Amino acid sequence: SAPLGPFNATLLEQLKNDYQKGEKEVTRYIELQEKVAEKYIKMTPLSVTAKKKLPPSKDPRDYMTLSPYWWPDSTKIDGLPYIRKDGERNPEVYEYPERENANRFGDAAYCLGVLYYITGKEVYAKACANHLRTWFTDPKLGMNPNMTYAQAVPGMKKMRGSGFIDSRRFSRALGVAKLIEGSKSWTPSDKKKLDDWATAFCYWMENSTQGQRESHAANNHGLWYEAIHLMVLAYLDRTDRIREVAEQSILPKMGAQIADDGSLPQELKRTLSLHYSTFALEALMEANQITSQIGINLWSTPASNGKVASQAVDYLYPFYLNPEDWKFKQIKPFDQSRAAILLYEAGTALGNQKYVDTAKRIGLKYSTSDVETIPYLVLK
Amino acid sequence: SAPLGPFNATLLEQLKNDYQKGEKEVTRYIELQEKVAEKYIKMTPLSVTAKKKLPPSKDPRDYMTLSPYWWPDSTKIDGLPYIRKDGERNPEVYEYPERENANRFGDAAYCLGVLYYITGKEVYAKACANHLRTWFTDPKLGMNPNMTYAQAVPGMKKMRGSGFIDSRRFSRALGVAKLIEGSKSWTPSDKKKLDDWATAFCYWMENSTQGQRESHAANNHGLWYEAIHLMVLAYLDRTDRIREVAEQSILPKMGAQIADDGSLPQELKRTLSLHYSTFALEALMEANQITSQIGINLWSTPASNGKVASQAVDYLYPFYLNPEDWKFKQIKPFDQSRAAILLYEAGTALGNQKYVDTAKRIGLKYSTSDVETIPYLVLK
Numbered sequence: 001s002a003p004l005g006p007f008n009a010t011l012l013e014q015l016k017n018d019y020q021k022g023e024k025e026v027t028r029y030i031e032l033q034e035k036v037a038e039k040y041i042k043m044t045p046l047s048v049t050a051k052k053k054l055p056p057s058k059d060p061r062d063y064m065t066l067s068p069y070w071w072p073d074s075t076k077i078d079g080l081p082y083i084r085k086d087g088e089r090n091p092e093v094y095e096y097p098e099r100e101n102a103n104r105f106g107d108a109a110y111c112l113g114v115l116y117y118i119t120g121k122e123v124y125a126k127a128c129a130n131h132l133r134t135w136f137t138d139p140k141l142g143m144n145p146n147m148t149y150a151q152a153v154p155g156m157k158k159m160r161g162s163g164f165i166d167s168r169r170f171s172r173a174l175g176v177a178k179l180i181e182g183s184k185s186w187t188p189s190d191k192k193k194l195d196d197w198a199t200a201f202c203y204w205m206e207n208s209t210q211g212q213r214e215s216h217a218a219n220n221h222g223l224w225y226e227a228i229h230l231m232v233l234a235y236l237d238r239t240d241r242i243r244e245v246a247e248q249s250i251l252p253k254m255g256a257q258i259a260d261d262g263s264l265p266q267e268l269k270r271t272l273s274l275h276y277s278t279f280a281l282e283a284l285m286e287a288n289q290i291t292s293q294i295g296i297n298l299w300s301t302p303a304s305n306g307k308v309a310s311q312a313v314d315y316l317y318p319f320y321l322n323p324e325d326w327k328f329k330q331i332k333p334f335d336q337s338r339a340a341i342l343l344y345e346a347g348t349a350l351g352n353q354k355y356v357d358t359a360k361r362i363g364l365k366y367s368t369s370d371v372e373t374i375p376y377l378v379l380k
Numbered sequence: 381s382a383p384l385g386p387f388n389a390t391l392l393e394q395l396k397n398d399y400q401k402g403e404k405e406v407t408r409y410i411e412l413q414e415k416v417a418e419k420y421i422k423m424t425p426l427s428v429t430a431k432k433k434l435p436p437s438k439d440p441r442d443y444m445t446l447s448p449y450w451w452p453d454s455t456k457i458d459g460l461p462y463i464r465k466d467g468e469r470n471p472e473v474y475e476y477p478e479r480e481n482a483n484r485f486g487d488a489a490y491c492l493g494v495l496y497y498i499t500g501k502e503v504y505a506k507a508c509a510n511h512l513r514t515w516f517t518d519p520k521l522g523m524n525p526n527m528t529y530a531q532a533v534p535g536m537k538k539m540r541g542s543g544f545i546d547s548r549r550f551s552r553a554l555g556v557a558k559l560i561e562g563s564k565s566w567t568p569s570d571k572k573k574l575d576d577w578a579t580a581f582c583y584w585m586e587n588s589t590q591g592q593r594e595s596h597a598a599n600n601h602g603l604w605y606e607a608i609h610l611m612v613l614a615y616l617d618r619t620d621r622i623r624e625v626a627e628q629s630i631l632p633k634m635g636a637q638i639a640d641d642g643s644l645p646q647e648l649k650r651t652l653s654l655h656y657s658t659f660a661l662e663a664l665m666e667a668n669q670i671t672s673q674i675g676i677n678l679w680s681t682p683a684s685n686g687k688v689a690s691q692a693v694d695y696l697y698p699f700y701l702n703p704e705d706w707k708f709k710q711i712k713p714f715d716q717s718r719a720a721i722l723l724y725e726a727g728t729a730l731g732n733q734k735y736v737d738t739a740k741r742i743g744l745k746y747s748t749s750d751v752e753t754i755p756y757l758v759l760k
């Protein structure tokens with residue numbers, strides 16, 4: 001049985017079982033994934049300290065990014081304070097190296113850790129561990145366990161927790177570290193350091209004002225906060241807290257954010273409303289991968305008002321079939337393929353075979369290098 | 381009379397004459413522009429050599445960018461060859477510093493040169509000259525006079541001239557250097573070096589295979605090629621060639637690109653078809669700013685085939701009133717404010733009061749720091 005973590009454990013256990021039996025289709029698929037993963041064996045580990053412009057703490061180990069929809073105001077001599085254009089990414093975001101480097105690290109650690117679980121090859125644990133040590137626990141290169149300066153905004157006077165949603169890029173890699181435990185390359189000292197980092201990160205996100213505020217956000221930020229929260233708690237093996245989070249935070253959030261007709265009105269007021277409805281359900285999808293490993297199905301368990309997450313999928317399904325029929329603001333085209341994994345996840349959790357069939361009809365490319373698609377041979 | 385250059389010379393002369401007469405409205409506007417321009421006096425001059433990853437020539441003085449719509453192919457192990465997603469800008473473009481640095485230099489040099497022309501204050505010529513020297517003529521920091529590696533694409537086997545369109549961000553700055561001739565800071569030796577650079581760049585764009593190809597492009601690339609061409613030719617005082625380019629290349633190109641209803645079919649097949657319809661006419665607008673300084677009006681002069689550029693403005697005008705009425709693919713919102721200067725330019729050249737009225741109704745923000753709007757107090 002697969003360790004508790006941020007992945008479809010059923011699909012991952014099935015892939016490993018078939019790989020070890022020498023099942024030909026799976027063996028070839030994993031051999032393709034190994035050719036994809038070679039670049040991560042070669043990759044120099046990234047660090048949040050690889051920036052020149054320091055955060056207000058003067059600590060290069062503090063994560064800092066620009067909130068993506070905030071732009072300099074041309075009518076101000078210094079451009080300050082920045083103003084918001086919902087749905088229009090300011091290219092200035094690429095001036096903060098950790099926005100993309102956290103994504104590159106997360107991909108590399110996720111791919112390598114999953115390949116170690118499937119194949120048992122030490123080379124993948126050794127390379128996974130190298131990325132994990134440098135990003136997380138190194139006393140010089142490792143990130144401080146906080147998101148204080150995530151999605152900062154020039155000129156903004158108030159503190160926000162909005163940037164915490166950036167954590168999902170590296171909290172998935174934190175969770176996969178559970179998969180390399182027991183390797184030779186991941187020592188007891190490595191585990192204790194990362195256990196301590198994860199405990200300090202969990203403390204920060206539960207007790208800092210920014211973490212508290214993000215825990216109560218009325219939209220997909222609150223849903224993603226608990227997805228991240230569950231990844232951290234599952235890394236730390238706190239299964240009682242996972243039950244408590246789902247019952248006391250995730251379910252009440254669903255019950256409030258799903259309307260009677262199954263729409264998500266907080267996402268409907270965005271300029272990318274079909275993307276943000278989908279993104280809210282992707283948060284529930286990642287939360288569910290974890291809750292369902294301990295017996296809780298987030299797709300069909302009702303809130304106290306009887307609302308269920310499947311209602312939100314039902315509402316969106318015809319627009320996954322035909323995005324052009326979407327009737328709310330969507331100022332960039334919607335990528336239909338983001339529905340494939342989502343409809344598969346929800347479909348199998350609900351026994352809804354129309355959803356699974358559509359997940360496969362949409363599908364994913366067999367040879368794609370997108371690391372989140374590794375477990376989904378079933379869609380390829 | 382203002383020196384020949386890439387600006388509305390009528391508006392620039394009017395601003396200078398009013399400023400010298402102490403007219404209050406103009407004097408206040410220019411004092412705002414002087415506050416805006418302060419950042420450029422302090423800003424450290426940029427150079428194309430400020431890059432890490434070198435181009436295939438191994439020369440940091442070669443300009444190099446990535447063609448913006450080309451992306452790694454995730455179904456290939458190394459992502460190669462890149463594939464095209466029209467209208468979707470790959471954020472990898474920001475890994476090539478001269479993409480945005482050419483923009484920043486172009487803004488800095490344009491603003492300072494225009495302010496030296498209006499105010500006569502030497503401090504603007506001194507700073508303008510500092511930017512010009514470093515970007516263009518410096519024997520270590522100045523760019524080589526070519527665009528061989530502009531908008532290169534990883535894995536593409538053929539040479540393209542498509543990246544030449546990048547030149548417009550610095551060819552306007554080249555044009556404005558004429559405005560600081562006669563200042564104390566811009567010496568005869570300075571002018572001589574920039575004359576030689578511009579002569580070599582003109583040779584490259586006219587005789588290189590890439591320049592030849594871009595000069596033959598049947599869409600807005602061909603229009604921008606000649607607008608840049610006219611800027612280089614005007615800087616070099618080749619008024620006889622300006623006339624020849626207008627009559628033998630620009631007007632025939634414009635006439636071949638306009639369909640019977642005034643639409644631009646080459647731009648209509650783009651995913652950003654309202655933007656590229658406008659971008660094609662913006663090339664003609666900047667070309668006309670120069671030709672009309674020697675008596676050639678590109679908006680009203682018919683081509684050989686009876687087509688005239690006013691017909692294309694006429695087709696687009698209702699969609700400038702209501703961009704939501706646009707019936708062709710436009711996968712990002714169209715910025716209506718780009719119609720302001722365009723309709724003013726075309727309206728004034730055509731004596732079309734309806735166009736000028738809408739230009740002022742749409743308007744530009746009085747306090748904006750966008751350097752391209754400096755001559756347009758009339759719209760603010």
Ligand SMILES: O=C(O)C1=C[C@H](O)[C@H](O)[C@H](O[C@H]2[C@H](O)[C@H](O)[C@H](O[C@H]3[C@H](O)[C@H](O)[C@H](O)O[C@@H]3C(=O)O)O[C@@H]2C(=O)O)O1
Pocket residue numbers: 067068069084086151162163165219220221276279
């Ligand atoms: O929705 C997301 O997951 C998301 C991801 C991006 O990285 C940003 O974090 C972005 O955050 C949004 C946030 O979700 C809200 O829509 C918020 O809206 C508020 C505005 O910022 C203004 O303050 C407005 O007056 O009120 C809004 C509100 O509270 O509804 O904006 C942020 C943002 O763009 O920073 O979305």
Ligand SMILES: O=C(O)C1=C[C@H](O)[C@H](O)[C@H](O[C@H]2[C@H](O)[C@H](O)[C@H](O[C@H]3[C@H](O)[C@H](O)[C@H](O)O[C@@H]3C(=O)O)O[C@@H]2C(=O)O)O1
Pocket residue numbers: 447448449464466531542543545599600601656659
């Ligand atoms: O239109 C522009 O000014 C423009 C600016 C961008 O920076 C790019 O240079 C982009 O160039 C376009 C170009 O205008 C054409 O649309 C071209 O189309 C060709 C495609 O690249 C393929 O080769 C296709 O098979 O044929 C197309 C054709 O010839 O119409 O694409 C480039 C580009 O995106 O590289 O536009």
